Amino acid sequence: FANWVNSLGEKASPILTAFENKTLTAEKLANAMNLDANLLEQASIQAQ
């Protein structure tokens, strides 16, 4: 988890406090990884 936070780096405070609340979304999470959000959406759907 610490290595994930260090992988995030600069945008860590808003995404960690969004994870601290129960309102964390895929779309804020994708922007911290420079990834397309639909990829995380489909990965969530495949896990579901």
Binding site: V5, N6, S7, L8, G9, E10, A12, S13, L16
Partner: protein
């Protein structure tokens, strides 16, 4: 047995960019203690404080 084709050349791996995260914390501020009255007038208590 020397091959006529020349062997393909490998592409080196990409190095990782080590990144640090710097976050800050929020400690709650302290409130005031209770007002306790004294004997002294204003300037002596003012100079004392």
């Amino acid at each position: 047995g020397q091959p006529l084709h020349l062997p393909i050349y490998a592409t080196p791996a990409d190095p990782k960019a080590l990144l640090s995260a710097a976050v800050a914390t929020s400690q709650g501020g302290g409130k005031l203690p209770e007002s306790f009255i004294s004997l002294w007038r204003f300037p002596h208590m003012l100079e004392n404080a």
